[PDB]
Amino acid sequence: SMSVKKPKRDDSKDLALCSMILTEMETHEDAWPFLLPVNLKLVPGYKKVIKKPMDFSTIREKLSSGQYPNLETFALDVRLVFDNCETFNEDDSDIGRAGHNMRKYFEKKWTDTFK
Structure with missing residues (x-):
């Protein structure tokens, strides 16, 4: 509360570490369905059904341009990719199957890096 704070976690490496995770997701052989935005002109049903499209290229651009305020907003967009896929x-x-595999891969790296 006011003037009452938990000890300050060092968050100075979060940006770098999220970038590294994301690199590892980008280079996984099962990443191909997720690398680029779904083409909403060519995939029937996608635009109407998936209210918030997300993909690795879009996460990379957001990451690179300071549009994630913290590591939780980053994880939310990664998970969104897999939730959309499901x-x-x-x-x-x-x-x-790609999406289940990638989600598992992500969650392990996330836990090992940050928990």
Whole structure:
């Protein structure tokens, strides 16, 4: 509360460490469904159904331009990528499996780096 604060966590490396995680997600072989924004002209249903599209290129540009105020907003956009994928794709499809795999990969790196 006012004039009453928990000890200050060192957050000076968060930006660098989120960039490294993101690099590792970008270079995973199952990243291909997530690298670029879904083409809303060419994929029927996507525009109407997925209210907040998100992809790795968009996260990279937000990251690079100071549009994440903290590491929780970064994680929210990563998770959004996978939540969108689950909304639109059957579990038993290449893309569906890609999204489960990438989410697992992310969550491990996130835990190991920050928890």
